[PDB]
Amino acid sequence: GSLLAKTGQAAELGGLLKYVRPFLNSISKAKAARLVRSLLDLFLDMEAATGQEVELCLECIEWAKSEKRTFLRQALEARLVSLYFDTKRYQEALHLGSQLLRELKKMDDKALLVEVQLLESKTYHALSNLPKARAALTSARTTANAIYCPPKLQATLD
């Protein structure tokens, strides 16, 4: 995956991701999930196949749901909220963020909640929704008090 990212390959990386699934369902859930996240991010980095990225990640989310890896599928849902904001998606990003918030507040994840709230504030600002953006950002601060030194995340919040 590192060499594929260095060269800029897309089809080979997609095939490798679609192939490594048995190895994913054979090891620690957290390690496999983070490997999946890293591979997906590296694939989405360079080659901008906007007609394929969303569909591939949605297939990955459906696969994670079938594997009952709830935190994995939630992480990819947050990643697609980020990709939706990158692609200037109007309200589908919004309802995906709302669904993520509903699924996550019942849990006690914190990094995902901060990222989701920050993305919601970002998309409110993109749609020029200033008061809801302010409310979401205040909630983002209230949630982000938890992580003490997330050096990237604190810069994002600021």
Partner: protein, 380 residues
């Protein structure tokens, strides 16, 4: 409150098939697609005018209507005969089911009868609110402006006084009376900017349609004061204009006072309002009033703007703009005069003192008429 909303849709489809004959091919298709469904035989005495007397579903559809209505009637007979449930009991919701059958299936007459019956029977807060809402919805369905006025009067007078946080669920259609009528200038807006919907997408066919009504009403309402801080500042407003680009297009065109795109967008707006049953200002306040406001805004802060250049700054056809200005000056607004021998627009804007003086003398005329009438009242 979901019922009578698809009924509103079929009513608007009948409007689009009947009043504009330009829509006579796709209008037939949508009318058929929403009338072969929804059990439209009793609500087909209105549909027979445009299409055939009855579409070819007669046997099956009438059997379905009669069977469903007979089943609900049997249920109502059981509740009202075998059981003596009175007042605060389940007979109230039984008669609500009766009215729902008579409305969503049968014609409006039986629905209105069942409504008035249970309204006179039970006067509880929740029941009364629900039935007032249903009466308003069926009135705005069948375009009985008399029924709409009646239910609006009773609700705004006493029904809404008892019980709160439901007026926020009702004003959006309680102001539909002003919406469907000509009064889209002040009252409709003042009570209609409230972005608190009783349902996410219902009543007025959508939240997007709700917003389009808001935009039309505000555009009729004012021109460009701190409207930036009244509606433009609205975050939900900006979001829904992002959802609707052309709507955002003409709204921002009016706000920016760019007439070149404004007139084309305004013609598009008038065309859209034609495809809408809320077309009461067919010749007064589609485009003529909005451009009266726009021309006032333009020629104010101006003294002598040339016709030939204001024409290209406001579209094309110098003769078209000249005749429009003449017609509107004859109408009364556009406080200015036209120097035809030199083709100039010499405005006459009164000072604050002068215009307000004129307003006071007008009101003095009206009140002298009033006091003369009252002097007639006395000494007789």
């Amino acid at each position: 409150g979901l019922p009578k909303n698809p009924d509103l849709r079929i009513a608007q489809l009948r409007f689009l098939l009947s009043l504009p004959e330009h829509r006579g091919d796709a209008a037939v298709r949508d009318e058929l697609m929403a009338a072969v469904r929804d059990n439209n035989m009793a609500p087909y005495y209105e549909a027979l005018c445009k299409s055939l007397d009855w579409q070819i579903d007669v046997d099956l559809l009438n059997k379905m209507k009669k069977a469903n209505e007979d089943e609900l009637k049997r249920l109502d007979e059981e509740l009202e005969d075998a059981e003596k449930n009175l007042g605060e009991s389940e007979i109230r919701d039984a008669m609500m089911a009766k009215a729902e059958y008579l409305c969503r299936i049968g014609d409006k007459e039986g629905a209105l009868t069942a409504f008035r019956k249970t309204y006179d029977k039970t006067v509880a807060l929740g029941h009364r609110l629900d039935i007032v809402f249903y009466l308003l919805r069926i009135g705005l369905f069948y375009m009985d402006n008399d029924l709409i006025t009646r239910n609006t009067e009773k609700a705004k007078s006493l029904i809404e006084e008892g019980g709160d946080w439901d007026r926020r669920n009702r004003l959006k259609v309680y102001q539909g009376l002003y919406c469907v009528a000509i009064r889209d200038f002040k009252q409709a807006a003042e009570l209609f900017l409230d972005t608190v919907s009783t349902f996410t997408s219902y009543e007025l066919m959508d939240y997007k349609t709700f917003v389009t009504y808001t935009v039309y009403v505000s555009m009729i309402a004012l021109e460009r004061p701190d409207l930036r801080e009244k509606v433009i500042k609205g975050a939900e407003i900006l979001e829904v204009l992002h959802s609707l680009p052309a709507v955002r297009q003409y709204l921002f065109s009016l706000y920016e006072c760019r007439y070149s795109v404004f007139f084309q967008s305004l013609a598009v707006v008038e065309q859209e309002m034609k495809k809408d049953w809320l077309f009461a200002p067919h010749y007064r306040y589609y485009v003529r009033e909005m451009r009266i406001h726009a021309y006032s805004q333009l020629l104010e802060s101006y003294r002598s703007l040339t016709l030939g250049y204001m024409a290209e700054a406001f579209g094309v056809g110098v003769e078209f703009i000249d005749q429009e200005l003449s017609r509107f000056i004859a109408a009364g607004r556009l406080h200015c005069k036209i120097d035809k021998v030199n083709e100039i627009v010499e405005t006459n804007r009164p000072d604050s003192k002068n215009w307000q003086y004129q307003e006071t003398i007008k009101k003095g005329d009206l009140l002298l008429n009033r006091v003369q009438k009252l002097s007639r009242v006395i000494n007789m």
